[PDB]
Amino acid sequence: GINSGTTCSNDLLQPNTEVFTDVCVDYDLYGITGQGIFKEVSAVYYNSWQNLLYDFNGNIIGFKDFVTNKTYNIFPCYAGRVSAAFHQNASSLALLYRNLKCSYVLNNISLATQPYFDSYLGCVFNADNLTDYSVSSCALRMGSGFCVDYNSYRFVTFEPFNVSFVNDSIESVGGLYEIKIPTNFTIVGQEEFIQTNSPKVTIDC
């Protein structure tokens, strides 16, 4: 019965520290090591012999105190990933925490040092928003129709294509229709390269 049980060593003196809630801290759990977020909740499924709860894989997502008799649910910590938008001519980085509101980031992850701005995908850094504008093509595509550019760093919605407009009537006024018939033309020839062959390679053991 490794890392679980009652009888065990007392060489490393450490008193019974009180349990903390809503904090991503490390725990001992009478042997079951790991780090997580403890949340307080009341349960009724616990019985006399029942004193711990697992999942289908085998992970722990909750337990019952041995002395306090208070039910606690173990939640996983946050180990996400931060993106960046670095331009060649720029000297700063447009850091963005995807799907994470920067309020929680400023109070429990980082410190407010750069001009932040809460957006739809999360909270960007080193950039202000200019969503009322529209860029035909952005070098960096952050996602969901949002892009950034250097000028400094901005936040403009991505609109790669849009239809032209003509100020003409659409109703059949006078029994006829209004259309735009061309009167002059020219020939423009584009090009397209289609890959057919590939360089053959040979590998020998």
Partner 1 sequence: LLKFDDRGVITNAVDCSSSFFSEIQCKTKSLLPNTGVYDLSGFTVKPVATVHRRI
Partner 2 sequence: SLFVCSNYAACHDLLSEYGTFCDNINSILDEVNGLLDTTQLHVADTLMQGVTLSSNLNTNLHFDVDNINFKSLVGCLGPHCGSSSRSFFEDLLFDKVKLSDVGFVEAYNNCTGGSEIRDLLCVQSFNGIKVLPPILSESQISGYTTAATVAAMFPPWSAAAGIPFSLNVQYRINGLGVTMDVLNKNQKLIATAFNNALLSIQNGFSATNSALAKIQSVVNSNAQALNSLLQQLFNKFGAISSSLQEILSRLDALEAQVQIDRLINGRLTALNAYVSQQLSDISLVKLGAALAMEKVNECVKSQSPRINFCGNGNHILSLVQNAPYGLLFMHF
Partner 3 sequence: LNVQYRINGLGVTMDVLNKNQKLIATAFNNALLSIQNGFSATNSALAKIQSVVNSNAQALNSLLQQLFNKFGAISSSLQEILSRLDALEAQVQIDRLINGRLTALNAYVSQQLSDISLVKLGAALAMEKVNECVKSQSPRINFCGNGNHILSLVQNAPYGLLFMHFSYKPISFKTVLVSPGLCISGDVGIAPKQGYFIKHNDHWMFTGSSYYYPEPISDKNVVFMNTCSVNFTKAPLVY
Ligand X SMILES: *[C@@H]1O[C@H](CO)[C@@H](O[C@@H]2O[C@H](CO)[C@@H](O)[C@H](O)[C@H]2NC(C)=O)[C@H](O)[C@H]1NC(C)=O
Ligand Y SMILES: *[C@@H]1O[C@H](CO)[C@@H](O[C@@H]2O[C@H](CO)[C@@H](O[C@@H]3O[C@H](CO)[C@@H](O)[C@H](O)[C@@H]3O)[C@H](O)[C@H]2NC(C)=O)[C@H](O)[C@H]1NC(C)=O
Say how many residues touch ligand NAG, by CB under 6 A: 14
Element (H, E) at 141: strand 140-143
Residue with tokens 């950034």: 148
C-beta of residue 37 within 8 angstroms of C-beta of residue 24: yes
Structure tokens at 64: 């019952």
Nearer to partner 1, 14 or 195 (CB): 14
Of partner 1, ligand NAG, ligand Y, none, which one does residue 35 interact with (CB within 5 to 8 Å by kind)? partner 1
Pairing of strands 140-143, 122-124: unpaired
Dist CA 33 CA 28 (whole Å)? 5
Cα–Cα distance list, 88 to 95, 139, 148, 167 (Å):
15, 11, 13, 42
Nearer to partner 2, 49 or 165 (CB): 165
Nearest distance from residue 205's CB to partner 3, in Å?
8
Nearest distance from residue 118's CB to ligand Y, in Å?
6
Residue with tokens 């850091």: 95
Tell me if 3 contacts partner 2 by CB under 8 A: yes
Tell me if 201 contacts partner 3 by CB under 8 A: yes
Tell me if 164 contacts partner 2 by CB under 8 A: yes
Q: State whether the Cα torsion 143-120-75-14 is positive or negative.
A: positive
Tell me if 9 contacts partner 2 by CB under 8 A: no
Nearest distance from residue 95's CB to partner 1, in Å?
6
Q: Can you give the binding site for partner 1, defined by CB under 8 A?
A: 6, 8, 14-20, 23-30, 35, 38, 65-67, 77-88, 93, 95, 108-109, 139-142
Q: Can you give the binding site for ligand NAG, defined by CB under 6 A?
A: 10-11, 22, 107-108, 134-136, 159, 162, 164-165, 167, 184
